[PDB]
Design a protein around this ligand. Structure first.
Ligand SMILES: Nc1nc2c(c(=O)[nH]1)N[C@@H](CNc1ccc(C(=O)N[C@@H](CCC(=O)O)C(=O)O)cc1)CN2
Length: 362
């Protein structure tokens, strides 16, 4: 498996490893529940260096990104980031990501681990008519997510500039524990928090410095297990599970990141699509302690209406929760059925999204 520059720290911390997207990563250190609670109560530090970072440099950096992503990057001002999706010619979703508008001549794209290759190949094969140079800097870049309601007050004493001045989905180059670091007020938890992008070689010392602070305010380093529970609770999508090239943004509740008034790949296909939105992604709350897995059929009074995309147990709500891609006719309040292995039916209630929202801003 692949190992991030923090692998050794995770091993010395006694974490249980799991194979995620080809990477040897920590599922949890102590326990998934405990780590989710650190995120929900104080702060949870995540090693997310398995994700990829692409660099776009050149006079037409803005318009290139604007051509590739569904969201409006052309209007973003320096130091602003934007969550978006990338579609193919048919409106299918290649990946979801975050792009940073450093300046008119430079942007940073951060994508999902399992899609680094596919994304980079797709991005590079579309640079031809743009005055830009695209490069993958993943191999030497690390990324750390410091999430939690106490994240800011805790991280601050190691950062040279005022964190308070960084607005939600905004970033700024700064020094953290003595090293050049891009600090953005972003996250995948639904709580307030930050993401620290830095040179892989400096990851160990930044992580060690931060760990010293965590023990002091009762925080915890957190694994992918907690990362998955927190994002599902926050109701953020997971590419490959809740969406893929066989779903368009409209079917998975991401219409808001699609601006049809500008030009981009998949635009024409999306115009037609939005006129016929037949599927939707709904939030379910199941009876029992069993966890639904992707692919389980979802029924309504005996008739199939879709399938599970993501499942997990929410300690915050104390319920088995899940996301499901179902027919347009499914409504909030419906009593559905999830078929578990062996035809075992499990009741589920369609509830309003998102399941939970913490201290995350804006
Ligand atoms: N760097 C960064 N980049 C990433 C991820 C990350 O983990 N951090 N993970 C993948 C993308 N997944 C998401 C999904 C949702 C959000 C998110 O934050 N959503 C808010 C956005 C609000 C807004 O833009 O105003 C919401 O309410 O829907 C962030 C990353 C790929 N790139």
């Amino acid at each position: 498996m692949k190992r991030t520059p923090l692998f050794e720290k995770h091993v010395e911390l006694g974490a249980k490893m799991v194979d995620f997207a080809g990477w040897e990563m920590p599922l949890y250190y102590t326990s998934i529940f405990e780590e989710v609670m650190a995120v929900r109560k104080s702060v949870g530090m995540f090693d997310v260096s398995h994700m990829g970072e692409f660099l776009v440099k050149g006079p037409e950096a803005v318009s290139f990104i604007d051509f590739l992503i569904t969201n409006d990057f052309s209007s973003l001002p320096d130091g602003k980031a934007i969550y978006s999706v990338m579609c193919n010619e048919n409106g299918g979703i290649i990946d979801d990501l975050v792009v940073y508008k450093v300046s008119p001549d430079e942007a940073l794209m951060v994508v999902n681990a399992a899609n680094i290759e596919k994304d980079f190949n797709w991005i590079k094969s579309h640079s031809k008519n743009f005055d830009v140079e695209v490069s993958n800097i993943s191999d030497t870049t690390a990324l750390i997510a410091f999430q939690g309601p106490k994240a800011q007050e805790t991280l601050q004493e190691l950062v040279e500039d005022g964190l308070e001045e960084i607005a939600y989905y905004s970033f700024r180059k700064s020094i953290v524990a003595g090293v050049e670091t891009l600090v953005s007020r972003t996250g995948y938890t639904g709580e307030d928090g930050f993401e620290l992008m830095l040179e892989a070689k400096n990851a160990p010392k930044v992580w060690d410095a931060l760990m010293n602070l965590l023990r002091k305010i009762d925080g915890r380093p957190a694994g992918l297990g907690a990362r998955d529970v927190c994002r599902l609770e926050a109701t953020y999508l997971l590419y490959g599970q809740d969406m893929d090239e066989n779903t368009n943004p409209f079917e998975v509740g991401l219409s808001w990141v699609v601006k049809l008034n500008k030009d981009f790949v998949g635009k024409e296909a999306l115009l037609k699509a939005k006129e016929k939105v037949e599927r939707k992604l709904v939030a379910l709350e199941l009876s029992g302690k069993r966890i639904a897995r992707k692919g389980y059929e979802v029924l309504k009074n005996g008739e199939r209406v879709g399938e599970i995309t993501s499942g997990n147990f929410s300690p915050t709500l104390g319920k088995s929760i899940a996301l499901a891609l179902v027919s347009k006719s499914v409504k909030i309040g419906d009593q559905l059925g999830v078929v578990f292995p062996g035809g075992k039916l499990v009741e589920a209630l369609v509830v309003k999204k998102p399941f939970y929202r913490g201290s995350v801003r804006r």
